[PDB]
Symmetry: C3
Subunit: 262 residues, 3 copies
């Protein structure tokens, strides 16, 4: 039962953090993990693997940390590490962190991800607010007749507040793909035709699960590379894996300023 696992998780978070309510939660992608220190000083740090439902029975142990960070007036639940669909787990395990955070009081979910830019005007190292998504995974985290509206899934309100922090923040449509292979240049030309500005391998299921629970979502991509076929050179996975470190302080500063305005 996702609801039951989510409440058992929230209880242990409340115990281990001695805080009964975290009103904001941030999921950090690979691209945003470097920024963790620049968010603020945490009051508690525990292994995600010690939390009910975080470690998919499939196998392995989540390599990720949960952090409790005071930012402005807010008490922030920071999830440093996420599970991806491309690891082969049921989506229940992929969106569990979002549901656990909701059951722990989260009103707002900041979902960060790495992405390829598809739009001429995007640069490597640029943070881009997510205006909307294309779920191209042919899956949903919802089972049975759980009908949810995905109008304004990325709160226009939270994007206004983000732009009060930095009026030059660009907006884009994020295409969520299964991965883990990068796209062919032909797949990228297809995604351009379908209205995509950004391409990644996360987020869309977390957004659906967050909206189904009634939480507000802010989505932020880090453009870690231009998308396949755009440069005329191949994608370097080394340049991509290292992209977050080139932007850590700038990204951490941005998240901390924007969360303070919620």
């Amino acid at each position: 039962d996702p609801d039951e696992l989510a409440r058992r998780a929230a209880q242990v978070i409340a115990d281990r953090t001695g805080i009964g309510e975290h009103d904001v939660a941030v999921v950090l992608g690979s691209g945003w993990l470097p920024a963790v220190a620049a968010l603020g000083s945490p009051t508690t740090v525990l292994p995600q693997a010690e939390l009910p439902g975080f470690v998919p029975p499939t196998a392995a142990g989540h390599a990720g940390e949960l952090l409790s960070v005071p930012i402005g007036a807010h008490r922030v639940l920071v999830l440093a590490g996420r599970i991806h669909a491309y690891e082969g787990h049921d989506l229940r395990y992929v969106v569990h962190p979002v549901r656990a955070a909701r059951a722990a009081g989260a009103q707002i979910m900041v979902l960060t991800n790495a992405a390829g830019g598809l739009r001429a005007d995007l640069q490597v190292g640029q943070p881009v607010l997510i205006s909307d998504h294309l779920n191209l995974t042919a899956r949903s985290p919802l089972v049975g007749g759980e009908f949810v509206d995905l109008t304004d899934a990325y709160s226009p309100r939270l994007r206004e507040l983000a732009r009060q922090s930095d009026p030059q923040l660009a907006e884009g449509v994020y295409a969520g793909l299964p991965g883990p292979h990068y796209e062919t240049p032909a797949e990228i030309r297809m995604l351009q035709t379908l209205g995509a500005d950004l391409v990644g391998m996360s987020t869309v299921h977390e957004t659906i699960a967050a909206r189904a629970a009634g939480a507000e979502v802010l989505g932020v991509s880090l453009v870690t590379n231009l998308a396949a076929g755009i440069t005329g050179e191949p994608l370097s996975h080394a340049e991509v894996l290292a992209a977050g470190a080139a932007s850590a302080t700038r990204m951490g500063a941005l998240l901390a300023d924007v969360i303070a305005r919620f």
Copy 2:
């Protein structure tokens, strides 16, 4: 084996109905089920639960009935309550009623559904004939080298006959998506680019099964809402259900009149 289970269902169906052969079958969508009464009144009701292959043995009280109804010269199997792909069961369960109906003698399947309207001419409460479909589920109900042609899958002949009942009927391409979440606005703009006029969460697998089994198909959508981002307004799931209820009489009367013409 699906085909085996469909033949045994058809044997039980002929025994329990006293009817050796049902020449037509209707799958009632969510937005059509309330129109069961205006089709005619049945000679037999059957609990799906008591029929070979209909209900996964571990299932929630989905209820579901198979009715035997006379309409003009026709003995019509009416499926009241279908298994959607978003319940998460094998597609063999989703298409079993079409295969069972075929084995029972149905050479015409009337496939009904609820749909979001993408085309500017379409309004809430409008029945629309299906001219063709986009299968955006990345699935097929067919396994191995069952290779089947979907040219004229929605019989032009049957759309002709429908239009003798109501000559004003529009027609449109239906996109079947997994669901159960509704589309983001950006997903709808994508489906417009791809050539969809209607969007729903069923029908496409049933059509493929029907054509593979050698039955003609008439598809009918009730437009229960404008698709996401067609207005500036979010989708209401309650107004989608209201449109179902509100269209009941007109939709049952339409099907009844169309089926007498076959």
Copy 3:
């Protein structure tokens, strides 16, 4: 571990062919099997069934044979028949042959398929070079964080070599669908907009697995039919077979001539 089973298949291929290393591998799909004779005189032939990890190919014509063929300065591993995703197999089994080929030395993978032509200038019986692919299966054969760049997935070098053998050879973008149903005319019109020239039900996962394992790929489609709705008539799936036989000694001699140039 797919990689252990691939190694162990390569050791058994080596011991039963008495050939330590094959530098080139050819996957012959549906309607290429006729061309196997004209590739050259095999040194050895084995049943694919005798090899660890190989599922018996069950499709039309598919022999389940392995042939060790000398062609120019190359020792060619010819897989006469493949496993399709539409048979319901985990992709680890679909791409196992490509991985085994690679563990036995394959530097180059020649992947052939049947395809429908979406450009009406293409002729039944025409071989078309694959320039790029659209993976429309919503799947990957890679599991966990296996990040692979698919820029130049279909080696430009190898297509230039093929055009040296036959300068008239067309190239096109292959849309890989799940199958096994053929597409609606609406779906074909959708695939044109997504930038596809060819449509089939194989190859894309084999290509990803080959690039993942460090092999170069040449893709060659045989146009067996014009795609649904391109001509007003339906598709004939006994005339899809007739293209395969008509294109035997032509195809087989083209492949032998192209590999000699590698």
